[PDB]
Design a protein around this ligand. Sequence first.
Ligand SMILES: Cc1ccc(C)c(OC(=O)c2ccncc2)c1
Ligand SMILES: *[C@@H]1O[C@H](CO)[C@@H](O)[C@H](O)[C@H]1NC(C)=O
Length: 341
Amino acid sequence: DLRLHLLLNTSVTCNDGSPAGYYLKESRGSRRWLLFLEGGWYCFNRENCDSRYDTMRRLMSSRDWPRTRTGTGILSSQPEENPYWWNANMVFIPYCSSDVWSGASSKSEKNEYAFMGALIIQEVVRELLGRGLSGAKVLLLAGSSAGGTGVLLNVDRVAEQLEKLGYPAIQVRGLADSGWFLDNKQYRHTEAIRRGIRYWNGVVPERCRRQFQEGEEWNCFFGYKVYPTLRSPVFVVQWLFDEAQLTVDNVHLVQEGLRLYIQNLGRELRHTLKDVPASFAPACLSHEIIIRSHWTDVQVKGTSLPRALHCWDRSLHPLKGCPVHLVDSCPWPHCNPSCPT
Ligand SMILES: Cc1ccc(C)c(OC(=O)c2ccncc2)c1
Ligand SMILES: *[C@@H]1O[C@H](CO)[C@@H](O)[C@H](O)[C@H]1NC(C)=O
């Protein structure tokens, strides 16, 4: 079990002004630290945030959080469940800012809600340095869905923060799960991101911001555009037929037009990953994420995700029998027999 700690700086808050926090399980025989960002869509104006506050309140508030959580999948401490990093120090950071981990805006006389995702990550890191993170060799910033996009937006800021605080020996890396989206044409008929950034005072990585310039920061929420601007090593996990991508595209899984649309989407996703040397992209229709207990089952070309992640660790010390670039080439959901059932 991971134990809850509410932030000691109580001005770094969830949407409703309650303190943000993190769940921690220490492993004193390890210098590896895994910090996982929870996902769960976002809200982008007063009216849709009010609706989320009525029926998704744990994603906007710490008032009802439980004292403990069980680590699962990549956050499990059992070797059978987690062949990759079972002995690491484990951190789960709840998503209570509704801003894709991008916000830097406090509640005030003009703001009904606080959007502080980018500042929550910074404050968690700062408070962990006093609890053993100061001695780490590797900090892996991981996350799923909105948390996976959050990794892409924040990994280089964590690296810069640790450099400026005087910890240049900690190697910062990212693991983005299910957060690599395409700004494609819908099957039936990006503005939500543009509106959100303004409402949240959202921030994006500086090298990407300098390319797209003022007003066009929404581009940096798209992995294929932001990834080439990043300096930290990043491993990308993405289903070729991701269910959230299909939802945004107004597809609900077939006649000829939809067959062509689905095949073209898988081809486009594969194309965006061609020059991503550390990646795992199975040809499956899924919303399943890396904290699920059976995450070990899926394989690409005979290699599982825990194995590919281990090979990535070795590569940061190509390797014989230890691949890190694993992208399916077959063109239809479940053409890989190991897809989640
Ligand atoms: C679940 C989730 C979390 C965060 C983001 C940014 C998501 O993607 C989009 O909002 C988006 C995708 C493609 N075209 C336009 C918009 C989806
Ligand atoms: C608490 O966090 C805010 C926002 O990052 C910061 O401005 C403030 O200085 C912090 N307080 C302390 C005591 O560090």
